[PDB]
Amino acid sequence: ELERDCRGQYLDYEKEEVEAQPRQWKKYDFHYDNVLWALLTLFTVSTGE
């Protein structure tokens, strides 16, 4: 839960076979980090999708 910690690779246990996947500090697609991003996020909320 920190960007410092979130580097390198981790063992993914999703495909039922372990695979090393990169550790990426990503941001959610709709994220309120701005009054313009919040506007688009709330638009998607109002449409319900």
Add this chain to the structure above:
Amino acid sequence: SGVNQLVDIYEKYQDLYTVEPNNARQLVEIAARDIEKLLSNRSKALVRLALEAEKVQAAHQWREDFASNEVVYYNAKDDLDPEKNDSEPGSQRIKPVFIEDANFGRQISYQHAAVHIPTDIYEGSTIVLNELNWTSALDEVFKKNREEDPSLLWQVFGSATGLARYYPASPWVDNSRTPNKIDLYDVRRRPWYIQGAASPKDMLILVDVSGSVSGLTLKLIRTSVSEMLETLSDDDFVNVASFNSNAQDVSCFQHLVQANVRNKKVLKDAVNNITAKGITDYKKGFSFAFEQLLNYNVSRANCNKIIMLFTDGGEERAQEIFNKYNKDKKVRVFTFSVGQHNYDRGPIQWMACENKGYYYEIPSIGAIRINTQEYLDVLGRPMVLAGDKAKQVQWTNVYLDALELGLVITGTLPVFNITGQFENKTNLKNQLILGVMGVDVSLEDIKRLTPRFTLCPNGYYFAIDPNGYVLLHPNLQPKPIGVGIPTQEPVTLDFLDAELENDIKVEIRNKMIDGESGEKTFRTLVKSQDERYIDKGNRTYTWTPVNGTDYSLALVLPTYSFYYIKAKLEETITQARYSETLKPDNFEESGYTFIAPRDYCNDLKISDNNTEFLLNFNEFIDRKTPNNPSCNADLINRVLLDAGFTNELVQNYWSKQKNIKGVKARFVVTDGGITRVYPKEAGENWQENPETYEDSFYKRSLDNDNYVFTAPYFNKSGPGAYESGIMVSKAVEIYIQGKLLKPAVVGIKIDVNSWIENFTKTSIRMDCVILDDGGFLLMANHDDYTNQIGRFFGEIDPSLMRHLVNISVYAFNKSYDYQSVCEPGAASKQSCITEQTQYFFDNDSKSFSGVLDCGNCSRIFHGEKLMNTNLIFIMVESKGTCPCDTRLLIQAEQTSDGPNPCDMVKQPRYRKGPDVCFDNNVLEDYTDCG
């Protein structure tokens, strides 16, 4: 064959050799001293390494900025391509020059140490970068250790941060960067790290199988309990209990059982079969756990009593149960909050605080592997505070090296945090070990301290643990121990499982575990190497304790092996004359010669392709005189002397006759290494081991003072029996100065047709079968059984075989092979336990007649045992009658689950635990519950 001719050859040349004694007591004492010298050399290396590691970490200053000062290291999981762009932001990566070394069998760099970092662990972190900085001193000490002892194998620093820094820089095994090859290796889960990081445990894993753990949480709990069991060694004792309003054992075990592979699999299956249902009661589960930790009627590691609570959460701190059972706090309680949930974790975290434990969260698969390493991290607190008494070298069970070297043991030593000492500072986390130092000892490093070539093929050494597991044994193979029926663990084979178990052998095993020294001559049931025959052997076990270690070395030695032939070849031209008889050009004057691929010369490389090794051996014999300290004088002298002896038989007694109607191949095999077979046309069909000490017929024929008929293999596509013959062998029994020596085994590959004719020729003066020991069909007269030559009798006609067993002309011993590769059934080839049986002449009587009461009919048979050989003639006269062929006596490696471990933990084998262990210290800071 020429038994008497070769005997006369041997006594005719008593001036060419000296009969020396195989003093078993002296041999065992010398080999035990050699083993303790090797292990003390490795212990000294470990002490050097741990001293420097503590000294250099204690003088390390923390940093959070390694860009201004990079750490230069070789990452083991790095591609050999010169990629300058493959450097982490905070570290410079070495690109090494790799030589190929025979001692390791891989690419090895002696200039620097390599570092393993788990994929789950980022190598640019502050923790890892600080470790990579202060471990370079370990690097140069690695170099010093190797230069003071060039025979050193891997010497490694397993760090508590996840890094493993091992000296000979070698790339990681196959998982550097490879699809389908993921590196799950973590040094803190290795058996040597776990062994050296704490004292033996007494876990009771409490599993919370109530309603609230259904679905994902139960899956995580069962995987977590499996991975928790996978950190338990053979000195730890474990039980798994589950509670939901009442506690019960998950498995057939009712008490703490030893955490060996088979018991651990029982517990793992019991956990996998567990179900979630009912309400929780943390009081009736902890009552059960504490009661089971107080059960002293059973074998235990009387140390480190633990409870591992695998719950999710709840609102029950269970004060009064802990007060009643854990008041002086002799038992630690580690609590795990498994799963992704919102239940109250407060009581779970408090149980860890009030009980010297630690609290862990496992929210998903992927967090499972690390928290277990962490309870081990907690358990080492009393070991650190017991500063230098704890730094004792321990030797791991035999296991398979990760960077493949086969079977190794490894000596461990904890490394402590020494930042504040005699300059006392806060010392916050100075209660944790820095890591464990390891040094590898190959089992082939021990096998050359126990030389077997002055011994009979039936004689050998073997060492033993205090658990009874063999450090050294001819029957211990580099394969994982089979654990049941198929659907990173030690190769722990017990002594009573490597051999055939008598009761004398159990007493000897207990005496060896106790560290006593003694001797015991007795009659054994020696199973043959091909694992189809059993001999009533006559052995002398002499054992000593290997001082300074918990091992115990013994020497098995037949009564006819107390003397051996030390070749007196010093004329330098007599041995040359014997040499020219070895060259692969005279394989029609002398027989088709095989030399045993032994370590005659340091520069000979042994090969399975025996003619290649024969060429190399002849080349080395050509120019030998300047090679005084390179070639083992005794082995080459013995093989040359025996080559001369077998030449004076293949020429002076076979080449003067050159052909006999009944034979198909005449062979002589010597304990020196020569296995000449005459015709060289049937010498191609000769498929016995070039090494004479690994020949099943040779060792079989030394026990019997008869002629041993080695039945061929049925349904085996190769040289066969019709076009190769069926083997007959007798061992020469020469006498020199009244000493019985059996230095060679002459033999005959009797032709099947020349013998079937003589079998049916005298019928004028149909069912008649020839059987040897083990009930194998040498042939019949029915000409349909002779199609199945060398097959077990019970496969052919089970009724008569079972009856003959019933009269006890054939006894049998059913045993378990724990190291057999296995075709996996359904609920490539895996490893299982096979259940192998061997038949043999039970009684010394010669004639056996009776009535075979087949169902609703009757059959009459007569069995007679041919004198001076291992054969029986069964004159059974009944064919095509009513079928009592209801089943079969399949004598083979029947895949089976081994002995019921539920039953053999109630009467377990004798076992000695570690003496000194560290728990329950008062200087300990229990306030780190996490």
Add this chain to the structure above:
Amino acid sequence: YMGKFHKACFPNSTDAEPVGDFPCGKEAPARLCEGDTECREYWPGPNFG
């Protein structure tokens, strides 16, 4: 549309779970299988069936 969501891309005779959560059709216009997989019957369907 009766019973047309029951053929999935199954692996080669392994009888395991199919690859992809989509129906398939060995015919021409439908969605074909790929990766040495066969489009055979007895798959519960999309959305657990």
Add this chain to the structure above:
Amino acid sequence: FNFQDETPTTNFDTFPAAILTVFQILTGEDWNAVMYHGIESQGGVSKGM
């Protein structure tokens, strides 16, 4: 709703969870996924429909 490998956040275990799930079904978004979970929680297509 404690299925294997997953517990949905749109469950009816607590009152906040149930109230949010019902509110989301009223707004209509992804009510079908919650329906699939509520069917598969009572035995699957065979007996939970």
